[PDB]
Amino acid sequence: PKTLPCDVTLDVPKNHVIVDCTDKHLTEIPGGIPTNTTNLTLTINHIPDISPASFHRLDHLVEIDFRCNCVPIPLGSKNNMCIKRLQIKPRSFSGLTYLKSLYLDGNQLLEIPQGLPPSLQLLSLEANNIFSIRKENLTELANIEILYLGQNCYYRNPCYVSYSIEKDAFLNLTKLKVLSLKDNNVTAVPTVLPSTLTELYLYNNMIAKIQEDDFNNLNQLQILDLSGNCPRCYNAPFPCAPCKNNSPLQIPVNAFDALTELKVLRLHSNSLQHVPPRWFKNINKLQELDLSQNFLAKEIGDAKFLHFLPSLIQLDLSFNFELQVYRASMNLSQAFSSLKSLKILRIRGYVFKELKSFNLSPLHNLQNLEVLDLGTNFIKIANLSMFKQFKRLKVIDLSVNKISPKYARSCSCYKYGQTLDLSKNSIFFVKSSDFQHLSFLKCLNLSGNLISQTLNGSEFQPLAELRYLDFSNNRLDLLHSTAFEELHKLEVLDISSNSHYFQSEGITHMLNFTKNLKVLQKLMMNDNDISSSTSRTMESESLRTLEFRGNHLDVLWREGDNRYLQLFKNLLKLEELDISKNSLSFLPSGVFDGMPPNLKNLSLAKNGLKSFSWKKLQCLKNLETLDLSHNQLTTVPERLSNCSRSLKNLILKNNQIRSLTKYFLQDAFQLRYLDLSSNKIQMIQKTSFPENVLNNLKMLLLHHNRFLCTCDAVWFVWWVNHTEVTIPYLATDVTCVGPGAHKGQSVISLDLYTCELDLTNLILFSLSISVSLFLMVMMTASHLYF
Numbered sequence: 001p002k003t004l005p006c007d008v009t010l011d012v013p014k015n016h017v018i019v020d021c022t023d024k025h026l027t028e029i030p031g032g033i034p035t036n037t038t039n040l041t042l043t044i045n046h047i048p049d050i051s052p053a054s055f056h057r058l059d060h061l062v063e064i065d066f067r068c069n070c071v072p073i074p075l076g077s078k079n080n081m082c083i084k085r086l087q088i089k090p091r092s093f094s095g096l097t098y099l100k101s102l103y104l105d106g107n108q109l110l111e112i113p114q115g116l117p118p119s120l121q122l123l124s125l126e127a128n129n130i131f132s133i134r135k136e137n138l139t140e141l142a143n144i145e146i147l148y149l150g151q152n153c154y155y156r157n158p159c160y161v162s163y164s165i166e167k168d169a170f171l172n173l174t175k176l177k178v179l180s181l182k183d184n185n186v187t188a189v190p191t192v193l194p195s196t197l198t199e200l201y202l203y204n205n206m207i208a209k210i211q212e213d214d215f216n217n218l219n220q221l222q223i224l225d226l227s228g229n230c231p232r233c234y235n236a237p238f239p240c241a242p243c244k245n246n247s248p249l250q251i252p253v254n255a256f257d258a259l260t261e262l263k264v265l266r267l268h269s270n271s272l273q274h275v276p277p278r279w280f281k282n283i284n285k286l287q288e289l290d291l292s293q294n295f296l297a298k299e300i301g302d303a304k305f306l307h308f309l310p311s312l313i314q315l316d317l318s319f320n321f322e323l324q325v326y327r328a329s330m331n332l333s334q335a336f337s338s339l340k341s342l343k344i345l346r347i348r349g350y351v352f353k354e355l356k357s358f359n360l361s362p363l364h365n366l367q368n369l370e371v372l373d374l375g376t377n378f379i380k381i382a383n384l385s386m387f388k389q390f391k392r393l394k395v396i397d398l399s400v401n402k403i404s405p406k407y408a409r410s411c412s413c414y415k416y417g418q419t420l421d422l423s424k425n426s427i428f429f430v431k432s433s434d435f436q437h438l439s440f441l442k443c444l445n446l447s448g449n450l451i452s453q454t455l456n457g458s459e460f461q462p463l464a465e466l467r468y469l470d471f472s473n474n475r476l477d478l479l480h481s482t483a484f485e486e487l488h489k490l491e492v493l494d495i496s497s498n499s500h501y502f503q504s505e506g507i508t509h510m511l512n513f514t515k516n517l518k519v520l521q522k523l524m525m526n527d528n529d530i531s532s533s534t535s536r537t538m539e540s541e542s543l544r545t546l547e548f549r550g551n552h553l554d555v556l557w558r559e560g561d562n563r564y565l566q567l568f569k570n571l572l573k574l575e576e577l578d579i580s581k582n583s584l585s586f587l588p589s590g591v592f593d594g595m596p597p598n599l600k601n602l603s604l605a606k607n608g609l610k611s612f613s614w615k616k617l618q619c620l621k622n623l624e625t626l627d628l629s630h631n632q633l634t635t636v637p638e639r640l641s642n643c644s645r646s647l648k649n650l651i652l653k654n655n656q657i658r659s660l661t662k663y664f665l666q667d668a669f670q671l672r673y674l675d676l677s678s679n680k681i682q683m684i685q686k687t688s689f690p691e692n693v694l695n696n697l698k699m700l701l702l703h704h705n706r707f708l709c710t711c712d713a714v715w716f717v718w719w720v721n722h723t724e725v726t727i728p729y730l731a732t733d734v735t736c737v738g739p740g741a742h743k744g745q746s747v748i749s750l751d752l753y754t755c756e757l758d759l760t761n762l763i764l765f766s767l768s769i770s771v772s773l774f775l776m777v778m779m780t781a782s783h784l785y786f
Helices: 334-338 357-364 384-388 499-503 615-619 711-719 761-785
Strands: 007-011 016-020 039-041 063-065 101-103 122-124 146-148 178-180 199-201 223-225 264-266 288-290 314-316 327-329 344-346 352-355 371-373 395-397 419-421 443-445 468-470 492-494 522-524 545-547 576-578 649-651 673-675 699-701 736-738
Touching: 334 357
Parallel strands: 016 039, 039 063, 063 101, 101 122, 122 146, 146 178, 178 199, 199 223, 223 264, 264 288, 288 314, 314 344, 327 352, 344 371, 371 395, 395 419, 419 443, 443 468, 468 492, 492 522, 522 545, 545 576, 649 673, 673 699
Antiparallel strands: 007 016
C-alpha cells in the first residue's frame, strides 16, 4: 500500500507478494519496495542499468521480470529509445539467495551476466546480442533448469556472425531440462547436450546437417523442435536463407535412436522431400508430429512411416503443395488407417480440385478422430452428403476452398457439437438436397459466401438438430416471416453483416421472423444498416440475448414516428440487448415503456447520445449492466436512487462529463460497478460519494480525466490517500491538469495543506487585533488620566 503504480497481489498460503510494474515508463527502480515480495516485474520502461543496490535489502525475491527495457531496432516500438544497451554491474544478483527465475529478454546484452546465485532455476536471455557462449560463463549456472537463449541472431535481430559454441558448453549443466536456441543463426547443434534434457528448441536456425552422434545421450527428451532449418520460403513474407541446391535438412536414418520418451517432434518448413520410417523406429510414444511447409506431396501418397506411429495424436501436414500443379484429386495412403489414436489431422495447403467420397476412405475407421481440417486447398466440387459417415467427428473444416452447389509473452460453435465450417466458399444459393443426410450437424458456418437469396422456410430442411447458424457476410432478403422456420431446434442465429438488402428502401423487412423460433436463445444481427421494417414488432418467447448494433435507429425511432417504439416489447425473456453504434442522437420518450420486462443487459455504446434521460430508467426494474460507453452525453442524473434500484454496472467511458451532482450516489446501495474514465470531470465531493455506499464497490475507474487537483476540495485530495476502494491506474494515468507547478502530478502522491484547517486562523487574528486595540485604548486612557 504505497504511491507506486505497480499492482500488488498478496497470497499468504503461497507466501507470494507479487509487485507488477508492467508498462509504467519507469526510469529507476522506486524505493520502498517491501521485503515480503517474491515476484517482481519491470517490463517495457526506461531503466538504464542494474546496480547491486537495486536488490539490496530484498532477500525473499523468487521471480524477477526485466524483459524488454529497450527492444532492438526492429523488434518493437520505435517511440521509446535508450542511449545504449543494458550494462550489468558485478555482484548484482548474488545477494538474492532465494532467487529462482530471471527474465532478461530484449535488453541488447552482449554477454551472459555473471554473479548469478546458484539457486537460479529459470533463466531467459532472448532478443539479445549474445552470439558466443563459453563454459567459463556457464560454470555458475550448474543448477539451472530452464534456459531460454533464443532470438539472438536472425533477420530481425542480426549479428552477422554464426552462433559459435565451444566444445561441451552445456555438459556440466546436469540440472538443465529445456533449451531454446531458436533464431540464433546456429550452424551446428552444440555437442554435447546434458542427458537430463526434456525439451530441445533448435528451430528457425541455419543447421544444414544432423550428426549421428548428436542426440546420442538425450534419453529423457520429450519435445524436439527442428523447424525452419533449410526452410521452404517460396513467397514468404519474411527474409529467408534457403539451403544450397534446394536441399532439405540432412537427418541420418539412425539419428532418433536414443530418443525414446520423445512425444513432440516438429519438422515444419524443412524442405523435406522424403521422411524414412527408420526415423520413427525407436520412438514409441510420439504424440505430436509437425511436417508443414515441406515437399511431402509425393510422400503423403506413400506415407509408410505412419506404420510406426501407433500413439500419435496430432499430425500437421499443411502447405505441402508443389508449385504450378493443380491436382484433380487428393491422394491419401491406406497407412492413414494405422494411426489408432489420431485426433487432430490438418491437411491444409494441399491444393487440389475435387474431393470425392472414397478419397477419405482410410479415415472412415478412426474412432478417436475429432478434427478434420481441409482448408486452403481450392477445392471446387465436393459432395457434402459424403460427410454422413463422419458423424463421430467434432469439426469439419471446409474453409476458403471454392466449393459450389515455450511460455514467452510478447514485449464459436465447438461447444455445441458437430460443426460444418463452410465459411468463405463459393455458394451463391442454398438448396435442400445439398444439406441432405446432415441431420447430426449441430453447427453450420456460411460466413463470407455472399449468398443472395430470400428464404421462405424450405432451404435448411434436413437440418433438424441444428443449433448454431452462421450467415455473416451474405445478402439475405427478408421477405417472409417464415424464414428459418424449419429450424425448430435452432438456439443461436447469426444474420450479421448483411447490409446489402437491408440498405434498400421500399422492400419489405419482416423483422418478426423470430416468432416461429421456439428455442432460439441468441441472435446476432450486427452491421446490417436496417433503416426500415414492415413488421411493427418482434415476437420471441425464448430469445434472451439480442445483438442489434451497427444499424440505423434514428430513422426507425424518428421524431413523430411512434410505429417502431415498441420493437423489443414482445421480447418477453430478453435479458441482453446490444443496440449500439446506430447513430442514435436522442432517445425518443416512450421506447423505455416498450422495453422487455426481463431486460438485464442494455448497451448504448458508440451511439452519439446528446441527452440521455435518466428518470425513465424506473420502467426497467431489472436492468443491472447499463452500458453508455463512448457517448456524447453531458449531465449525470440528479439522484441515482430515484432512477433505478437494481442498476449495478453503470459504464460511462469516453463521454463528456464536467461535474457530478451533489447527491449522485445518495442512498444508492445496490450498485457495485462504475466507470468514469476518459472524461473531463474536475471535482468529486463527499456528499455525492459517501463511504457508506463506497464500501461495497467492486471496481471504480477515474483515469485519463482532467482533474485539477487544487485545494478547493482538499478532502478529495485526502479521500484518495486513506480509503480502500479499487481504483486502478491511480499513479500513472489519472493525473492533474493543473494548476501550474502541479501539472502531471499523481492523485495518490498529493498532500495539500494550503487551505487553513479548522478556523483557528480567524480566532488568532481576532485575538491579535483585540489585544492591540485593547493595549492602545488602555495606554491612551492611562495618558489621559495621568
